[PDB]
From Swiss-Prot, chain A:
V-ATPase is a heteromultimeric enzyme made up of two complexes: the ATP-hydrolytic V1 complex and the proton translocation V0 complex. The V1 complex consists of three catalytic AB heterodimers that form a heterohexamer, three peripheral stalks each consisting of EG heterodimers, one central rotor including subunits D and F, and the regulatory subunits C and H. The proton translocation complex V0 consists of the proton transport subunit a, a ring of proteolipid subunits c9c'', rotary subunit d, subunits e and f, and the accessory subunits ATP6AP1/Ac45 and ATP6AP2/PRR. This is V-type proton ATPase subunit E 1. The chain holds residues 4 to 57 of 226 of the full protein. Keywords: Acetylation, Cell membrane, Cytoplasmic vesicle, Hydrogen ion transport, Ion transport, Membrane, Phosphoprotein, Synapse, Transport. Subunit of the V1 complex of vacuolar(H+)-ATPase (V-ATPase), a multisubunit enzyme composed of a peripheral complex (V1) that hydrolyzes ATP and a membrane integral complex (V0) that translocates protons. V-ATPase is responsible for acidifying and maintaining the pH of intracellular compartments and in some cell types, is targeted to the plasma membrane, where it is responsible for acidifying the extracellular environment. The lineage of its organism: Eukaryota, Metazoa, Chordata, Craniata, Vertebrata.
Curated annotation (Swiss-Prot), chain C:
It comes from Rattus norvegicus. Subunit of the V1 complex of vacuolar(H+)-ATPase (V-ATPase), a multisubunit enzyme composed of a peripheral complex (V1) that hydrolyzes ATP and a membrane integral complex (V0) that translocates protons. V-ATPase is responsible for acidifying and maintaining the pH of intracellular compartments and in some cell types, is targeted to the plasma membrane, where it is responsible for acidifying the extracellular environment. Subunit C is necessary for the assembly of the catalytic sector of the enzyme and is likely to have a specific function in its catalytic activity. V-ATPase is a heteromultimeric enzyme made up of two complexes: the ATP-hydrolytic V1 complex and the proton translocation V0 complex. The V1 complex consists of three catalytic AB heterodimers that form a heterohexamer, three peripheral stalks each consisting of EG heterodimers, one central rotor including subunits D and F, and the regulatory subunits C and H. The proton translocation complex V0 consists of the proton transport subunit a, a ring of proteolipid subunits c9c'', rotary subunit d, subunits e and f, and the accessory subunits ATP6AP1/Ac45 and ATP6AP2/PRR. Expressed in brain (at protein level). Belongs to the V-ATPase C subunit family. This is V-type proton ATPase subunit C 1. It is found in: Cytoplasmic vesicle, Secretory vesicle, Synaptic vesicle membrane; Cytoplasmic vesicle, Clathrin-coated vesicle membrane. Transmembrane segments: none annotated. It comes from the Eukaryota. The chain holds residues 165 to 273 of 382 of the full protein.
Length: 54, 57, 109
């Protein structure tokens, strides 16, 4: 029994590391979204104020 | 001893936490980058509007 | 009350993908449970069982495992007549029982 249980879990535990890597890739997708959102909000708000001044 | 199996659980969780933490660090760095790149682009727009305003003057 | 026996070193907690379950078994059936419990779900490590204590009828053990295992494990535990008692190191509750034990036994006197 015990040796087969050790081999089985040593295979299966890799899916936990894979799903954590996918969670990290989702946090990086949120990084790309929030970059574009923050840059858009800042640039458009100030571009309009600069335009109105001139 | 149970440390055989317990350290395999903790190893997968520590690896998982490292990947998630590294992505969270990148997320914070990207938010700072958005401020820096926005600050550059609004000044470039102001400089273009200034050159146009000086030409109209 | 679990306040008689529980200590932090027997538990794996405070984790995104890890859980501790707690299960009671009769003292004769414990000799089968020691192997059978690892069959109740996938995503269970070998030697995941830490015993907290025995008594005149039974044993209680912590089982350490990944989060995907737990609902299959608990349902198959109930199917095999093993009894769930998931006291996941409730430090506030063990301290409250100790405080009321010392207080009530003093205050009655």
């Amino acid at each position: 029994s015990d040796a087969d249980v050790q081999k089985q879990i040593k295979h299966m535990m890799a899916f936990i590391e894979q799903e954590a890597n996918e969670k990290a890739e989702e946090i990086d997708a949120k990084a790309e979204e929030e970059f574009n959102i923050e840059k858009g909000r800042l640039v458009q708000t100030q571009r309009l104020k600069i335009m109105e001044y001139y | 001893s149970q440390s055989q199996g317990i350290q395999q659980l903790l190893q997968a969780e520590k690896r998982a936490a490292e990947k998630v933490s590294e992505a969270r660090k990148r997320k914070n760095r990207r938010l700072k980058q958005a401020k820096e790149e926005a600050q550059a682009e609004i000044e470039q727009y102001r400089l273009q509007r200034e050159k146009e305003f000086k030409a109209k003057e | 009350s679990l306040a008689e026996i529980v200590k932090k070193d027997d538990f794996v907690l405070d984790s995104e993908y890890l859980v501790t379950l707690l299960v009671v078994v009769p003292k004769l059936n414990h000799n089968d449970w020691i192997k059978q419990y690892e069959t109740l779900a996938e995503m269970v490590v070998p030697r995941s069982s830490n015993v907290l204590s025995e008594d005149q009828d039974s044993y209680l053990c912590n089982v350490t495992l990944f989060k995907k295992a737990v609902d299959d494990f608990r349902h198959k535990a109930r199917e095999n007549k093993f009894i769930v008692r998931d006291f996941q190191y409730n430090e506030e509750e063990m301290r409250a029982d100790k405080e009321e034990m010392n207080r009530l036994s003093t205050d009655k006197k």
